[PDB]
């Protein structure tokens, strides 16, 4: 007397058709379900009073906002000549190099992106009344902020996603609201009298967004959570995988910028961002899943999985979330192997596209910071190769900014380490970013911190070593008369310091930059075998001490070297040496005898102005032969810092 | 009105093993009600008529959720069955009950 066979007699009015379904036959053909578990789950013998009492309990929308959205062609056509790589079978001979086309198969990749399996749809109070118990291979993103009094858990299969907002308030009522996204043809099974059109909020030609909660849970949530489901559903369908991920990545940085990740105010945009983080992970795994045993282009994988890695690494610092799944080891090893096919120090010599493509694999290949510290040499080479080809003091390019941002993560991840072995290359990277932070740079960024989409995302000032960026001095480089959207000017300047949370910790480990004057440093400039500390006071345990003509109002400008990064046992005794003026220099040079030096110009009223690291001959040529040196303005001095620890002041050229 | 969904008497048991020949009814037949009667294989005359009336909307959604979860082995006989249960489930008075 086992589960063998049952007959289904349908009373089509007048016809009385009959059907049969055997449990024994198909319970073994497609295993993974037990009918008796669903039978004692649907309340077969439920009375009509209990079913209606359950129906009136779940909140039901008064309509369904219908908007026809078209979806983009995310995964490109297979490049003729690519090599199909098995995600489960990867050996160093599968690929030849970066300049070789490639694509990874979609079937083994799906088994790696959703290796973990678990019960997705729980039996909680709001969920056990609508859906059936489902248990598929899932990848979830879960976090909690206010001491576990507010939880979010967005679980997703290869075809649909479900996020769940759970806030427990004071006395113990736990208000639970959930949203479901995916194709209308693949939504989970509904239990009881519930239909989907009465529950979906936005329905496109093929996709739909459902909201499942009680009237009391929706009412209390409607006070502080009034999301824009129109634009939310439009961007979740019309945008690609990488573009949508970078979109959420930008709005996450804006939350970290002002408050947010330290004190999360339960805002409408705050909860809206948490859902879109799970959608960013979904659209990547969903686009791969919608390929019929084809292959996903490797260049597209590096372009999409780079965003998920940074997105997973930014929520681990912001909310301490947990992301299981959506991390295929075959891709992590195929990208890590691709590092031996290129040279790190010579990485900057490659094409701009190959530069950005190699840095996506640098983050995807070694996501865990510390497995390979030599990746800094590649990111430093990209920045070094970009400095020599960049017009001096000019703001960066959308392409160049994307190129340096896409590799700056391997620098930030190594900065989070307590001790690092790639010391010199980290000081070489921070020195170039310091020389790149010009007055025009923080002018376009401050202008881009209201309108530009890419400008506020990245800037070498964040990795710079400047310390004179006070709110007063940053306000002296506005984009315009400051009346053009005046409110955005003060909010952008107050936010620029908000994006100075580089090495703001929850572990106390920023001991990675010997002075007794901490909060009065103006700049640090590390050269070879000397690092100069520019400060506004005398107490710096250095091997010398120089003082330049400061302003007229008392704010002295000192700078002192430390030979070979070995500070002396005590401070200086006598008067600090005066910087000497030199005029005997040929403006037309034949060799880079200034290579390795640091040329810095400072004003007498607004403090420092520039910093120019002499890297090659092409840089020195655009320094002397240009109109950089302006000696008619007597209050604009030019201090040159040598590798011998000597400091000079260029006063004339011939 | 064709039958009635009753409160579960404490001593009445139901197991999917001994149940067969389930009867689903259209709306026009029972004033708009979704009524399903559960029976057993006809074992002759042993006093027993185990006609067990149940909530149809829950039974229909169960057989819809048990055919969609196994769509790979869905034959032509069951492909028509899944489509007829979908149209029967949507043609009911979910809200119209006073």
């Amino acid at each position, epitope marked *: 007397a086992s589960l063998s066979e049952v*007959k289904l*007699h349908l*009373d*089509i*009015e*007048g*016809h*009385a*058709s*009959h*059907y*049969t379904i055997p449990w024994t036959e198909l319970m073994a053909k497609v295993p993974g379900l037990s009918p008796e578990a669903l039978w004692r789950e649907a309340n077969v013998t439920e009375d009509l009073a209990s079913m209606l009492n359950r129906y009136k309990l779940i909140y039901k929308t008064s309509g369904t906002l219908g908007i026809a959205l078209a979806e983009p062609v995310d995964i490109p056509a297979v490049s003729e000549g690519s090599m199909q790589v098995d995600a489960s079978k990867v050996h160093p001979g599968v690929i030849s190099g970066l300049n070789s086309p490639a694509c990874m198969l979609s079937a083994p990749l799906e088994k790696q992106l959703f290796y973990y399996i678990g019960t997705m749809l729980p039996n909680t109070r709001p969920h056990s009344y609508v859906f059936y118990q489902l248990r598929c291979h899932l990848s979830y993103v879960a976090l909690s902020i206010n001491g576990d009094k507010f939880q979010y858990t967005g679980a997703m299969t290869s075809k649909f996603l479900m996020g769940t907002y759970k806030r427990v308030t004071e006395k113990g009522d736990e208000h639970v609201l959930s949203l479901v996204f995916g194709k209308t043809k693949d939504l989970p099974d509904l239990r009881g009298p519930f239909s989907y059109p009465s529950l979906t909020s936005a329905q496109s030609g093929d996709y739909s967004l459902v909201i499942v909660t009680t009237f009391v849970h929706y009412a209390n949530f409607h006070n502080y959570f009034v999301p824009n489901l129109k634009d939310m559903f439009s961007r979740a369908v019309t945008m690609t995988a990488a573009s949508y991920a970078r979109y959420v990545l930008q709005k996450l940085v804006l939350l970290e910028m002002k408050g947010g990740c330290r004190e999360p105010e339960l805002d409408t945009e705050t909860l809206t961002t948490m859902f879109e983080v799970s959608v960013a992970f979904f659209k990547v795994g969903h686009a791969v899943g919608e390929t019929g045993n084809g292959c996903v282009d490797l260049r597209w994988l590096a372009k999409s999985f780079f965003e998920l890695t940074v997105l997973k690494d930014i929520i681990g610092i912001c909310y301490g979330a947990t992301v299981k799944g959506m991390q295929s080891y075959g891709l992590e090893r195929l990208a890590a192997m691709l590092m031996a096919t290129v040279k790190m120090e010579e990485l900057g010599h490659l094409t701009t596209e190959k530069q950005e493509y190699a840095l996506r694999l640098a983050t995807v290949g070694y996501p865990k910071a510390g497995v390979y510290s030599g990746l800094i040499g590649g990111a430093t080479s990209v920045l070094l190769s970009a400095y020599n080809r960049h017009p001096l003091f000019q703001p960066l390019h959308t392409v160049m900014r994307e190129t340096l941002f896409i590799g700056s993560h391997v620098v930030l991840r190594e900065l989070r380490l307590n001790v690092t072995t790639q010391g010199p290359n980290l000081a070489l990277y921070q020195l170039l970013s310091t020389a790149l932070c010009s007055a025009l740079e923080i002018g376009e960024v401050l202008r881009g911190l209201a309108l530009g989409t890419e400008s506020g995302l990245f800037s070498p000032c964040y990795l710079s070593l400047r310390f004179d960026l006070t709110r007063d001095k940053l306000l002296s480089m506005a984009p315009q008369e400051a009346t053009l959207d005046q409110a955005a000017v003060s909010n952008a300047v107050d936010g620029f310091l908000g994006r100075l949370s580089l090495e703001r910790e929850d572990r106390d480990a920023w001991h990675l930059p010997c002075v007794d004057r901490l909060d009065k440093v103006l700049m640090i400039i590390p050269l070879i075998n000397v690092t100069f500390i520019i400060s506004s006071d005398r107490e710096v345990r250095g091997s010398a001490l120089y003082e330049a003509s400061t302003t007229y109002l008392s704010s002295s400008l000192f700078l002192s070297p430390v030979i070979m990064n070995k500070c002396s046992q005590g401070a200086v005794a006598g008067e600090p040496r005066q910087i000497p003026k030199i005029q005997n220099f040929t403006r037309t040079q034949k060799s880079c005898i200034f290579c390795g030096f640091a040329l810095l110009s400072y004003d007498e009223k607004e403090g420092l102005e520039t910093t120019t690291y002499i890297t090659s001959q092409e840089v020195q040529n655009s320094i002397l032969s240009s109109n950089y040196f302006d000696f008619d303005n007597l209050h604009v001095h030019y201090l040159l810092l040598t590798t011998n620890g000597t400091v000079m002041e260029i006063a004339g050229l011939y | 009105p064709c039958c009635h969904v009753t409160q579960l008497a404490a001593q009445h048991l139901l197991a999917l093993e001994n149940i067969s020949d389930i*009867y689903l009814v259209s709306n026009q037949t029972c004033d708009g009600f979704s009524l399903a009667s559960l029976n057993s294989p*006809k074992n002759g005359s042993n006093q027993l008529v185990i006609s067990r009336c149940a909530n149809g909307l829950n039974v229909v959604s169960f057989f819809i959720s048990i055919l969609k979860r196994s769509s790979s082995a869905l034959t032509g*006989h069951l492909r028509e069955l899944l489509t007829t249960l979908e149209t029967l489930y949507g043609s009911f008075s979910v809200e119209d009950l006073f």
Partner: antibody
Amino acid sequence: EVQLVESGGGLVKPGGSLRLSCAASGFTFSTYAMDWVRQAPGKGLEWVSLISSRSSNIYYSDSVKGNFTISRDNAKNSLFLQMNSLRAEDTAVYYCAREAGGFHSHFDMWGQGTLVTVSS
Amino acid sequence: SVLTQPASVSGSLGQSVTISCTGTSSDVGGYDYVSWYQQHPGKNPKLMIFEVNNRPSGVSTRFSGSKSGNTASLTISGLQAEDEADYYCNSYSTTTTWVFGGGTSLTVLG
């Protein structure tokens, strides 16, 4: 009275049209579903179109051409079986059957029958 | 598609004939919904046995059936009035929605 007798039609050229109208009276017409069953003069008993109650689901046999258009409306109690082209000279005695309804898949009532000869 | 019935079977006044009928496993051996219809020569047939051993109103206790595997056998029991008509067979076929048997002819010998 539960008389269920068709009006019917006479002979027809191979390439011809005919509309067999099965008039039924007495019972409730909207509660049951209607059928057509035809019998070849020798021994055959084949099945024809299946119009349901309120014209919701229409079925046909495999041997019937599929281009045998059936329809009905319960206001005027009748049952039209519109045949078109019937150029096959495969005639039969088209009875009008009555589906039992409920859950029973049997015929509880039958018709008198209609003779439609097709020759040249 | 039709069900295969015996061509012509004969019996005498007694319990002489219980005519058979068979079909596909999805037609008769899949549902207890076979049926039997008696047709006198040149007249309207009428339901003689609905389902299987379930008779309608107005039928003597001789008409019965058989619950075999995939063969339905109408049973006219041990008394024979002269009913020399043609017996037919049918059931709800999942494939054809209605399938009728070949058609036989019981002839009484008395």
